[PDB]
Design a protein around this ligand. Structure first.
Ligand SMILES: [Au+]
Ligand SMILES: [Au+]
Ligand SMILES: [Au+]
Length: 129
């Protein structure tokens, strides 16, 4: 599914991402925009052989098993295809774990390069939350 901006904001809000680890909702919406263009099905291969899955582009090197990422971990203990569902619960729950691990949202390259230090509240503007 390709979410609408305020549609994703609302769904991320109900799953408890708004100020989760101090990251306002706009950070999560901004990161999803630039990671996946709000598309739950987005998949992108990394140069290292891993693949990024879903609306928050969670990586197979560390977080999920896709069956083809040799020498890697599955710390969310999920097949990566679970990250492509139109229900974003699995992506969210895995991301809480990622963002909690000491590197915060800097684990998301699109966030660090396109969201961090920006006026991210603009991503939730006009949304009913
Ligand atoms: Au949801
Ligand atoms: Au949830
Ligand atoms: Au994020």
């Amino acid at each position: 599914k390709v979410f609408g901006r305020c549609e994703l904001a609302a769904a991320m809000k109900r799953h408890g991402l708004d100020n989760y680890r101090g990251y306002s909702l706009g950070n999560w919406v901004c990161a999803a925009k630039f990671e996946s263009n709000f598309n739950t099905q987005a998949t992108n291969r990394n140069t290292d052989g891993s693949t990024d899955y879903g609306i928050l582009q969670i990586n197979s090197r560390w977080w999920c098993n896709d069956g083809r990422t040799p020498g890697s971990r599955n710390l969310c203990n999920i097949p990566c295809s679970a990250l492509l569902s139109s229900d974003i619960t699995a992506s969210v729950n895995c991301a809480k774990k990622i963002v909690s691990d000491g590197n915060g949202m800097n684990a998301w390259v699109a966030w660090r390069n396109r969201c961090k230090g920006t006026d991210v509240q603009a991503w939730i503007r006009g949304c009913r939350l």
